[PDB]
Amino acid sequence: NLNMDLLYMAAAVMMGLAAIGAAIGIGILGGKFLEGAARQPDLIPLLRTQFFIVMGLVDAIPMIAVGLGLYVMFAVA
Amino acid sequence: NLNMDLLYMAAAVMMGLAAIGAAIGIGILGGKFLEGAARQPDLIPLLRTQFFIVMGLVDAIPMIAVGLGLYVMFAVA
Amino acid sequence: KFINTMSQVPTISQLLPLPASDDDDLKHKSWDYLYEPDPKALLDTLLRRYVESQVYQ
Secondary structure, eight states, X not given: OTHHHHHHHHHHHHHHHHHHHHHHHHHHHHHHHHHHHTTOGGGHHHHHHHHHXXXXXXXXXXXXXXXXXXXXXXXXO | OOHHHHHXXXXXXXXXXXXXHHHHHHHHHHHHHHHHHHHSTTOHHHHHHHHHHHXXXXXXXXXXXXHHHHHIIIIIO | XXXXXXXXXXXXXXXXXXXXXXXXXXXXXXXXXOOSSOHHHHHXXXXXXXXHHHHHO
16 A cells, blocks of 8 residues: 555665765765874774774664664565 | 555665765775875785775665665565 | 094085985885975975085084
């Protein structure tokens, strides 16, 4: 019925934006990780650590939205 | 009926947003990578490695977006 | 050139164009300065100040 139109439409718009957020949000981060390494690469293993520390925070909301989108698409059908 | 039309619409939205995200993320990351090599050519061995390590995380989510867009277009539609 | 307490020799030496360094800073590979504000306007001042010391010397 009509539901199974929009139940997919929503799942798209939620998971599409959740992509634009997660990708760009990390890229802006990753760039600053590289330009620092490209000056004094001796700190690569140090900075990489901090990188993950902060990247986990970036994927806080995007992965929540992806989870809700998967719930809407599969469980709610 | 109308179901397949808006299923295609939903997959279209999903993949357009996923493409925006992946493109701009890898672009901003590669810009800084192309700066690092110039400053310190001879470590290119290394900046490219780290760049791939970051690109994987950048693309993690857009890949899911494309996966589910295809899942819709050619299993649900 | 002051060489010994009883031996001094007149020398003509080249200051600019800059003479060629015996050493190689390929070993400085592994680091680069965070040039503030910008490297070219800074190298200009570095070179001017360097000829001055060598003259003073």
